[PDB]
Each structure stands twice: as C-alpha cells, then as structure tokens.
Design a binder for these strands. Structure first.
Lengths: 65, 65
DNA sequence: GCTTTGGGGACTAAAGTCCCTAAC
DNA sequence: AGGGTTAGGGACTTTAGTCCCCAAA
C-alpha cells in the first residue's frame, strides 16, 4: 500500500488506470484534455519506477485486493 | 476463474500480459514474432469481450488472487 | 513572485485490427 | 492428402508515452 508520494489525483489516476480505461476516457471522468492526461500518467509511472500503464494497473489492482 | 475458451497458450498470454510486458517482450518469452503476438493477444481480447490489453491484465490479476 | 495544477508542440513508439497466406 | 492448428506478413489507424516549455489561479 505504498501510495506515499502520489498527489491528490495521482491516487485517482491509479484507480482509473486499473479500470483499463483510455487516457481520453480517464480524461472525461476528470474534465481534462487527453494531452493533460498523457502527462499526469507518464509522470506517475516515473514516480512508480514503471514504464507502462499496464504495470501501474496491475500494481494498483494488487493494492485494491 | 473463467479460463474456459482460452487455448493452451492463451492462458499463458494472460500471465505474461499480467506482468505488464510488451508484445515484443512477451514474444521473446514465447519465441514468436511481435506481429504474431499482436494477433494472438488481439484475438484473446475479443474472446474476453474486452478491447484493451490493460483490461485483460487486471482481470487476469484478479484471478491470480 | 511563486507553487500548484492544466495543456500545446512535436513526435517516437507501441498497440490494435483485419484479412489473407504457408507450414506442419 | 484435403484438413485443422500454429505462426506471421501487409498495411494502416489509434493510443500511449516523452520532454520541455507556457499560463491561469
């Protein structure tokens, strides 16, 4: 449960990622632009030591359980 | 645990997918080409009623636990 | 005069889709 | 030997991702 380091919405970029959504879908759910999302997510992977959104999801998926 | 329908290696295309690997990484671990894997995976998502490999992975991740 | 917090530019690269061949 | 698996090319269209810099609050 190492969610220490993730901003407000970065922990909520993990739950949307873990529902195998697309940047643009996750975008609408948050009122951003897809470009904005691409950024936040790509930062978040860096913060996580991962290089693919899929790893983030599975990792998130493991926390939720 | 609905792995009924999945061929031999389709159940193993779900364990590799669930490690957030890439078609080409997955393809090395299976001795295929990346093109070959693009196809297998894409079929497998159809068989699963999903349209994005991330979904597959999370779903797979939920079975493993 | 700064921190958050949102997004364009500008691509490089993965992912996916569909349909159609060969090799056992 | 005309058939099912099992593997991949063609040929793109879409999402993802990367970095770095730019304004509003």
């Amino acid at each position: 449960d190492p969610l220490s380091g993730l901003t407000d919405q970065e922990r909520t970029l993990l739950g949307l990622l873990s529902e195998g959504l697309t940047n643009k879908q996750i975008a609408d759910r948050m009122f951003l632009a897809e470009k904005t999302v691409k950024n936040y997510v790509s930062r978040l992977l860096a913060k996580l030591g991962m290089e693919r959104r899929t790893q983030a999801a599975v990792f998130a998926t493991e926390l939720k359980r």
